[PDB]
Design an enzyme around this catalytic site. Structure first.
Site, PDB file in Angstrom:
ATOM      1  N   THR A 297       0.816  -1.209   0.000  1.00 42.77           N
ATOM      2  CA  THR A 297       0.000   0.000   0.000  1.00 42.77           C
ATOM      3  C   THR A 297       0.858   1.270   0.000  1.00 42.77           C
ATOM      4  O   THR A 297       1.884   1.344   0.691  1.00 42.77           O
ATOM      5  CB  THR A 297      -1.028   0.007   1.136  1.00 42.77           C
ATOM      6  OG1 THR A 297      -0.356   0.010   2.406  1.00 42.77           O
ATOM      7  CG2 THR A 297      -1.909  -1.256   1.036  1.00 42.77           C
ATOM      8  N   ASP A 298       0.418   2.250  -0.795  1.00 49.75           N
ATOM      9  CA  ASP A 298       1.172   3.485  -1.020  1.00 49.75           C
ATOM     10  C   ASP A 298       0.744   4.590  -0.041  1.00 49.75           C
ATOM     11  O   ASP A 298       0.031   4.335   0.939  1.00 49.75           O
ATOM     12  CB  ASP A 298       0.995   3.917  -2.493  1.00 49.75           C
ATOM     13  CG  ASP A 298       1.890   5.094  -2.899  1.00 49.75           C
ATOM     14  OD1 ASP A 298       2.874   5.391  -2.180  1.00 49.75           O
ATOM     15  OD2 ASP A 298       1.588   5.738  -3.937  1.00 49.75           O
ATOM     16  N   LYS A 299       1.199   5.808  -0.323  1.00 52.08           N
ATOM     17  CA  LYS A 299       0.958   7.002   0.475  1.00 52.08           C
ATOM     18  C   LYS A 299      -0.522   7.158   0.788  1.00 52.08           C
ATOM     19  O   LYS A 299      -1.358   7.175  -0.120  1.00 52.08           O
ATOM     20  CB  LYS A 299       1.468   8.231  -0.301  1.00 52.08           C
ATOM     21  CG  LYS A 299       1.637   9.515   0.512  1.00 52.08           C
ATOM     22  CD  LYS A 299       2.355  10.593  -0.321  1.00 52.08           C
ATOM     23  CE  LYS A 299       3.761  10.144  -0.724  1.00 52.08           C
ATOM     24  NZ  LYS A 299       4.356  10.955  -1.833  1.00 52.08           N
TER      25      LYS A 299
END
Length: 313
Positions: free
Chosen positions: A60-62
């Site tokens: 999962t990203d920002k």
């Protein structure tokens, strides 16, 4: 304590974090601290995560949240291990379940798909000329049907080069398999209307879901014709709007293939509780108070879908 490979089901609100993977704050920074302080792992396994055979199933990203992240690692199986890890985590990161597995089980290698949910205010689907544009908007059956007709076009295997960066039209690594994508009926919380889009894919590339959502949002609101979706499979570059990360939540990491027993049915109450204490309040509250979606939507009128192509790029 005995040394075992375990699988952990974990959840987090991702707002203000730069991602899951240890890198600027990350979920794994906090998780690794908690693992060391709980005594699950020695300090040097926190320093070199390969030494505990660590794997995460979803990068999962920002700003992205998770209701069902899954990691696998080797630990000293101490007493009351979940309580102890959790005692060293902030309230918005929670270990929800544990399973003992065979020593060579590696979760990322064994999972077959990931499902994400995208929770968004329904005025993201309001047509720019035909519909009111603010919180008073209510989603019509017709518009929902249009959203679903468009999202279904994503299913199958496609070249998603226009839905990520640094990949060309002819790059086989840009091909990804989407199993399901659809939008649920809308609901009201705190007097505001939201809907959930769900997407199940075999794997996802950087920016991919945010751009898959952003494009359908742009089309539905009237900023591009529906034909641009098909066009985005083409060889030529299309500049696809990227929706905010706030509403994106990892829902499930799939082990159906492997199971055919990593089933988290017993943890469903814990999952629901964490969503309500941390994920829903953060997303909806941020939309209500800071108007994240509304502000991003206000930038669509100047989005040029052909900017790259027009520069012979």
């Amino acid at each position: 304590p005995p040394k075992r490979k375990i699988v952990l089901l974990m959840a987090y609100s991702g707002k203000g974090y730069h991602g899951m993977q240890r890198n600027f704050k990350t979920i794994e920074d906090d998780l690794v601290s908690a693992l060391v302080r709980s005594g699950c792992i020695p300090e040097n396994h926190g320093e070199d995560m390969r030494k505990m055979s660590f794997q995460r199933c979803a990068r999962t990203d920002k700003g992205v949240s998770a209701a069902g992240q899954v990691v696998s690692l080797k630990v000293w199986l101490i007493d009351d291990i979940l309580e102890k890890i959790n005692s060293h985590l902030p309230s918005h990161i929670r270990i929800l379940g544990l399973k003992r597995v065979t020593g060579g089980f590696n979760s990322k290698n064994r999972c077959d798909a990931r499902t994400y949910c995208y929770l968004l205010p329904t005025f993201a689907f309001a047509h720019k000329d035909r519909d009111v544009q603010d919180e008073t908007y209510r989603l019509s059956a017709e518009t929902l049907q249009q959203v679903n007709r468009l999202l279904a076009c994503y299913k199958g295997t496609h070249n998603f080069h226009n839905f990520t960066s640094q990949k060309g039209p002819q790059d086989p690594s840009a091909c990804r398999y989407i199993l399901e994508m659809y939008c649920e009926e809308p609901f009201v919380r705190e007097g505001l209307e939201f809907a959930v889009i769900r997407v199940k894919g075999q794997s996802f590339m950087m920016h991919q879901i945010r751009k898959m959502v952003g494009l359908v949002v742009a089309i539905v609101k009237g900023y591009a014709p529906e034909s641009v979706l098909e066009r985005s499979w083409g060889t030529e570059k299309v500049d696809v709007p990227k929706a905010p990360g706030l509403g994106l939540v990892l829902e499930r990491v799939h082990f159906e293939k492997y199971n055919q027993p990593l089933d988290w049915a017993q943890e469903e109450g814990k999952v629901a509780a964490f969503k309500e204490e941390h994920i829903y309040p953060t997303i909806i509250g941020t939309e209500r108070d800071e108007r994240s979606m509304a502000q991003w939507l206000s930038t669509l009128p100047i989005h040029n879908f052909s900017a790259t192509a027009l520069t012979a790029g």
